[PDB]
Design a protein around this nucleic acid. Structure first.
Ligand code: K
Ligand code: K
Ligand code: K
Ligand code: K
Ligand code: K
Ligand code: K
Ligand code: K
Ligand code: K
Ligand code: K
Ligand code: K
Ligand code: K
Ligand code: K
Ligand code: K
Ligand code: K
Ligand code: K
Ligand code: K
Ligand code: K
Ligand code: K
Ligand code: K
Ligand code: MG
Ligand code: MG
Ligand code: MG
Ligand code: MG
Ligand code: MG
Ligand code: MG
Ligand code: MG
Ligand code: MG
Ligand code: MG
Ligand code: MG
Ligand code: MG
Ligand code: MG
Ligand code: MG
Ligand code: MG
Ligand code: MG
Ligand code: MG
Ligand code: MG
Ligand code: MG
Ligand code: MG
Ligand code: MG
Ligand code: MG
Ligand code: MG
Ligand code: MG
Ligand code: MG
Ligand code: MG
Ligand code: MG
Ligand code: MG
Ligand code: MG
Ligand code: MG
Ligand code: MG
Ligand code: MG
Ligand code: MG
Ligand code: MG
Ligand code: MG
Ligand code: MG
Ligand code: MG
Ligand code: MG
Ligand code: MG
Ligand code: MG
Ligand code: MG
Ligand code: MG
Ligand code: MG
Ligand code: MG
Ligand code: MG
Ligand code: MG
Ligand code: MG
Ligand code: MG
Ligand code: MG
Ligand code: MG
Ligand code: MG
Ligand code: MG
Ligand code: MG
Ligand code: MG
Ligand code: MG
Ligand code: MG
Ligand code: MG
Ligand code: MG
Ligand code: MG
Ligand code: MG
Ligand code: MG
Ligand code: MG
Ligand code: MG
Ligand code: MG
Ligand code: MG
Ligand code: MG
Ligand code: MG
Ligand code: MG
Ligand code: MG
Ligand code: MG
Lengths: 74, 64, 50
RNA sequence: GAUGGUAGUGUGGGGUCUCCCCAUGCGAGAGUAG
RNA sequence: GAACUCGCUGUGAAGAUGCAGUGUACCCGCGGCAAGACGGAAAGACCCCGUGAACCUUUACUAUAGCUUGACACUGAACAUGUUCUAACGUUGACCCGUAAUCCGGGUUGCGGACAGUGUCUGGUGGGUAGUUUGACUGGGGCGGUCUCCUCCUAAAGAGUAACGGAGGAGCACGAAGGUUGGCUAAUCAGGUUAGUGCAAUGGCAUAAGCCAGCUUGACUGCGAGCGUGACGGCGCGAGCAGGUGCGAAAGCAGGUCAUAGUGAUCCGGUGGUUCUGAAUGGAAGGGCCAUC
RNA sequence: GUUUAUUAAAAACACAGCACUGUGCAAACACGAAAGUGGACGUAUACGGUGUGACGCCUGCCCGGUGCCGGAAGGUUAAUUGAUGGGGUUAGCGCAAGCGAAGCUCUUGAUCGAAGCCCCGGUAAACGGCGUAAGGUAGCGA
RNA sequence: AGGACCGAACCGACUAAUGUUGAAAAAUUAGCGGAUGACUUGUGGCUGGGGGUGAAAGGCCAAUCAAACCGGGAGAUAGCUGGUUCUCCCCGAAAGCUAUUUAGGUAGCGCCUCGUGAAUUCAUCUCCGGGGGUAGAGCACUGUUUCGGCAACCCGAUGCAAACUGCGAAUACCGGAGAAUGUUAUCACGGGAGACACACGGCGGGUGCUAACGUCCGUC
RNA sequence: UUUUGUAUAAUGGGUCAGCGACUUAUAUUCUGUAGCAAGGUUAACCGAAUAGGGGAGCCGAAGGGAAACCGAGUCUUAACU
RNA sequence: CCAUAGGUUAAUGAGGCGAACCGGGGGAACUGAAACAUCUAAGUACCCCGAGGAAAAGAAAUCAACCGAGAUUCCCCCAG
């Protein structure tokens, strides 16, 4: 009755804290927002977080909800 | 005897200035309504044959 | 169940869009203002056969 | 929310080897004083 | 293959004269016996595999001889659609001649007669005959199950990761269920999402991603810095730029939908469009390009 | 009687007998691109094919399926025939946009059209079946 | 009279032994059947290979038969098996992924080699910047579970979980900085491959019986 | 030899001598080497000629675009930051 | 019935053989397509007929492109 699975989706963190990015670079692929778009970061339609500026990646526990934000530091 | 061109290949590839090959993209013949405009717009321009495929193409086109 | 249809320009060019439609639930012909890139203006587009 | 101990564990070695132990490094969670 | 060719218990490509340990054994015939030398003989016939072969079967596929249908031809006349007619044609009736000849031909006559028959074309039938096809995975093969896609676990805290491992889904829906602005907040009978999400599971969701209303078509066209993921074909995310549009007071937001399934390369062809091509030339046909089936 | 020369001699094959069916003679049928030839110098008491297998007593029910036979109202339907529409070209007429005869041409495919098939019957010593076409009779039975 | 009877010749071939590098590529010996017939035999003739002939065994057609023999197409094709010959020096795999009428074949990629070119390009270690949800743990959640108090719910105490998480390591991985060391150890492009049957052992697991010198992954 | 693995009780060889398996033609690409160099080279053929003649061709010095066409640009688009 | 078929004799020629090449009449399959049917192998092998020192072909109802060429045959290009 079993014997099915789907293709693994290659989700996860593509650029970790302190790595240099160009604008456009994907930082995390995810289902929903485990991570949230901080400063200089967009959120794509599949909740991909991507750099809007050149700079370094910065993850932070920020908000009243203890939520994890991806931002690009100049 | 002269090597014979693979004539199917010659209808699908053209040699560029620096010796690579441009081809037309797959997936833009039919079943177009369900496809996104963005997808279809990016399939219009001709693309280059990749590194892995060049050996296969060159074999087919000895008079490229 | 959904059937493919042609949204065709009122501008008189031949730019058509394509979409689907549930003809059983929506028997009336669909009409929408959409960008015609020949005349380069938003015009009325009206349903026609695919 | 310490401290201490315990669990786990990288490397090397060992045993009675379904599981452990020793050397060394890292060291929780829970609970406790607070 | 070469031999200076013992037993045993172990070992070991897993059943040893040849390895280890050990026991026994002076050298060499002759007659006997067949327990072993996985003895000799035949590149296992069983079994599986090969996109091997053959022959056989059939309502497997494609053909096809044969049989059969009609049209046209050979093939005509007169009356009316049918009937009559004779002259084509048939005769495996009779007779005559070549001729000594149950062949054959020619002649005369009878009978049949535009029929029959044959050619070309054409529908049917057609294992009579022929060429072939008849998947793969698989704790042997078959039978059963499975084959693409999505979600979770196995998966060893980056990614990825197998089994006929453990559990479920998809092959859509929606011109609103899309866009925006402004409001609004559940299950349950005590509280805070324990509800909701168009449809599985997981991750998300209050700034709600839930729900409602008004106004709308951004379910825009041309592009795209950069990046993710693939052997590749591809697939995905994407600021920003140009044009034009919607909502909003404006900042802004909008290139379909909370996200992750809802899919099919190429060929061949259809449809519309087209500052392209047009085999002497002008056209056209066909081809190209764009959109789409 | 016959048979697997060389591992099978049999319950297998054949057989007289039986039945069905074809065949009117230039027979059906067979060998042959054909001419011919066999059938047969035979003619339905004959000949071919098929099944059964001396003899005795017998051989039930089913025609829905497949085949065969008969039917031809109705439907569908080939070559053939080429209506009718559309396109291409261009003598002309347009100041130009276009329009456009004839001829030629590309295409469309009305009408005509047989058998077959669907359809209506028959047929089981046809292939078969015998709890739906009909439900296994007689006889026999570990 | 008779496909009548008994039985030699003659024609067969039921049984057994022998023989089985035979006396013999089918016989001999002792028995056995038919023996006036659908009998047997001499000579000659005819039928030809998808063809013949067949009282039917796929029998027989020159010791050959589910398509004779000889020559030719012909060196058919063989993803299969076998074999592949002198010497030295340098480097040195893979038995994986993806796809495949694919699975013992093949292609791209990975890994080997040779050449060309170029960044402190790469590695180890130290320090710095990261994201984890595994081990362990726990029980608020999803479930499961025991006991007590009250009796619908909840509470106290106690366990359990690959598809539980109000926690959470070691390691590993990504990035940055620095020294030392290392024949550039790295990356790119180009010539040539082989390989895509792996095995056992350690560790982490699925499966199996925490059975297998079992089977399937990850990693050394 | 074949294999994960063979003293293997897997394969092959009784022995010796002789023979017995990556070739050849043409095309194409890369490397080395030689000539000439923005050029290089001729084919058939002629020629008594390994000479010499023969430059028909071929490759190269330009690309882009499906194509018309444009050209150190060109294509894309109404037009490119 | 004229005749014509037929009959007889004469003269002349043919016949049969031979390696390839050549023109014509027929015409496979293995094989390749990683199966296979279109397609391929290939108008090949093979069979048959006929001829000659050669055969066949041959003086445009040919090309070309508005400029022109000038029968046929063979070689090198064009061009995989
Ligand atoms: K010993
Ligand atoms: K013995
Ligand atoms: K007639
Ligand atoms: K298995
Ligand atoms: K097994
Ligand atoms: K815009
Ligand atoms: K007998
Ligand atoms: K019937
Ligand atoms: K044969
Ligand atoms: K490969
Ligand atoms: K290489
Ligand atoms: K292992
Ligand atoms: K083996
Ligand atoms: K053996
Ligand atoms: K070469
Ligand atoms: K050279
Ligand atoms: K450019
Ligand atoms: K063939
Ligand atoms: K093949
Ligand atoms: Mg998944
Ligand atoms: Mg298209
Ligand atoms: Mg502590
Ligand atoms: Mg603690
Ligand atoms: Mg032993
Ligand atoms: Mg002896
Ligand atoms: Mg003996
Ligand atoms: Mg033996
Ligand atoms: Mg064998
Ligand atoms: Mg007729
Ligand atoms: Mg048939
Ligand atoms: Mg057949
Ligand atoms: Mg074949
Ligand atoms: Mg076959
Ligand atoms: Mg299989
Ligand atoms: Mg992971
Ligand atoms: Mg890990
Ligand atoms: Mg997986
Ligand atoms: Mg792996
Ligand atoms: Mg694997
Ligand atoms: Mg799996
Ligand atoms: Mg770019
Ligand atoms: Mg604008
Ligand atoms: Mg939706
Ligand atoms: Mg959804
Ligand atoms: Mg076609
Ligand atoms: Mg067109
Ligand atoms: Mg023209
Ligand atoms: Mg008898
Ligand atoms: Mg016998
Ligand atoms: Mg016998
Ligand atoms: Mg007769
Ligand atoms: Mg019988
Ligand atoms: Mg009987
Ligand atoms: Mg009829
Ligand atoms: Mg009846
Ligand atoms: Mg008698
Ligand atoms: Mg006999
Ligand atoms: Mg005897
Ligand atoms: Mg007797
Ligand atoms: Mg007797
Ligand atoms: Mg048999
Ligand atoms: Mg014989
Ligand atoms: Mg055969
Ligand atoms: Mg051949
Ligand atoms: Mg051979
Ligand atoms: Mg070495
Ligand atoms: Mg795949
Ligand atoms: Mg645990
Ligand atoms: Mg867990
Ligand atoms: Mg590092
Ligand atoms: Mg393989
Ligand atoms: Mg493998
Ligand atoms: Mg394996
Ligand atoms: Mg393995
Ligand atoms: Mg293990
Ligand atoms: Mg085990
Ligand atoms: Mg094993
Ligand atoms: Mg083995
Ligand atoms: Mg050994
Ligand atoms: Mg031995
Ligand atoms: Mg051996
Ligand atoms: Mg072998
Ligand atoms: Mg041997
Ligand atoms: Mg150019
Ligand atoms: Mg083939
Ligand atoms: Mg002569
Ligand atoms: Mg001549
Ligand atoms: Mg002139």
């Amino acid at each position: 009755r079993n014997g099915r699975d789907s293709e693994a989706k290659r989700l996860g963190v593509k650029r970790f804290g302190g790595e240099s990015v160009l604008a456009g670079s994907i930082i995390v692929r995810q289902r929903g927002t485990k991570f949230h778009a901080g400063a200089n970061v967009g959120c794509g339609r599949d909740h991909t977080l991507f750099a809007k500026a050149d700079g370094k990646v910065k993850f932070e526990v920020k908000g009243p909800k203890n939520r994890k934000f991806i931002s690009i530091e100049a | 005897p002269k090597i014979k061109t693979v004539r199917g290949a010659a209808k699908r590839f053209k040699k560029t200035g620096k010796g690579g090959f441009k081809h037309k993209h797959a997936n833009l013949r039919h079943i177009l309504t369900k496809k996104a405009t963005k997808r279809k717009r990016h399939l219009r321009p001709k693309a280059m044959v990749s590194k892995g495929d060049l050996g296969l193409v060159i074999a087919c086109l000895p008079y490229a | 169940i959904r059937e493919k249809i042609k949204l065709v320009s009122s501008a008189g060019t031949g730019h058509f869009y394509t979409t689907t439609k549930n003809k059983r639930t929506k028997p009336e012909k669909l009409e929408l203002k959409k960008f015609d890139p020949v005349v380069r203006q938003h015009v009325i587009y009206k349903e026609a056969k695919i």
